Amino acid sequence: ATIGRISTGSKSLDKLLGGGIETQAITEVFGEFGSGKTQLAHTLAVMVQLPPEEGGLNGSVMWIDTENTFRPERIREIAQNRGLDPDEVLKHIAYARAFNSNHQMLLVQQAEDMIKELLNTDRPVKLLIVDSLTSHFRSEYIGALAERQQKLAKHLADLHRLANLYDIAVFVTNQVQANGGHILAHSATLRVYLRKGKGGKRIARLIDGEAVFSITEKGIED
Numbered sequence: 001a002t003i004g005r006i007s008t009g010s011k012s013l014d015k016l017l018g019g020g021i022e023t024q025a026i027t028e029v030f031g032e033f034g035s036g037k038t039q040l041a042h043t044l045a046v047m048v049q050l051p052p053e054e055g056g057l058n059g060s061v062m063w064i065d066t067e068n069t070f071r072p073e074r075i076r077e078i079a080q081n082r083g084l085d086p087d088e089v090l091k092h093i094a095y096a097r098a099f100n101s102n103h104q105m106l107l108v109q110q111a112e113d114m115i116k117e118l119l120n121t122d123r124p125v126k127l128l129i130v131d132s133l134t135s136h137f138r139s140e141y142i143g144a145l146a147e148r149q150q151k152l153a154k155h156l157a158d159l160h161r162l163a164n165l166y167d168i169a170v171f172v173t174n175q176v177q178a179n180g181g182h183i184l185a186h187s188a189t190l191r192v193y194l195r196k197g198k199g200g201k202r203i204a205r206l207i208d209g210e211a212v213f214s215i216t217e218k219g220i221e222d
């Protein structure tokens with residue numbers, strides 16, 4: 001398959017990304033608590049459902065939530081201010097809460113079943129969100145970093161295999177603050193550092209110029 005792109009909703013961020021996040025890729029966004037990673041995830045879950053002329057892929061979404069941070073009412077707001085029907089947008093987001101890191105790993109295998117079911121339809125899965133990818137692994141493997149890296153490595157390999165095999169954009173969030181961070185090391189296809197700036201602006205930079213955007217009723221925008 002050719003490489004598809006999903007607009008983030010922000011022209012600035014899209015330019016930094018070469019058009020949007022890529023299918024057949026894992027995009028990892030990392031930054032402190034409150035930097036806007038989950039807002040970007042919510043926006044992408046709407047944007048992907050637009051036609052390509054508007055920066056989408058007419059795609060379905062799968063969302064794995066580890067922190068109970070998915071908000072359908074926020075999806076509705078973004079959809080209504082992106083000219084989509086909110087009920088239709090929500091109907092094309094498959095949502096699961098991961099209870100712990102082992103369940104999170106099983107949910108990625110389950111996602112493959114729904115990906116296969118929709119593959120030949122007019123609304124194939126085009127976006128898989130894992131928010132937050134690292135939170136359960138971090139809490140469960142305190143004092144056991146070597147074992148944590150083993151399990152994370154397999155989890156990321158699973159996510160790569162889905163991105164490439166099924167032409168999906170995988171978007172993952174990772175909270176990194178004070179003294180923290182191996183990030184995801186070199187595992188993602190693309191690392192994006194997100195941070196707060198003056199006056200509520202958000203600033204994004206590729207790790208390995210800068211885009212500036214705001215969080216609004218449209219999700220994110222310049």
Ligand SMILES: Oc1cc2ccccc2cc1O
Pocket residue numbers: 062063064094095096107108110111114
């Ligand atoms: O109905 C489902 C929703 C999911 C969402 C994310 C990951 C896996 C899922 C599996 C389902 O059957």
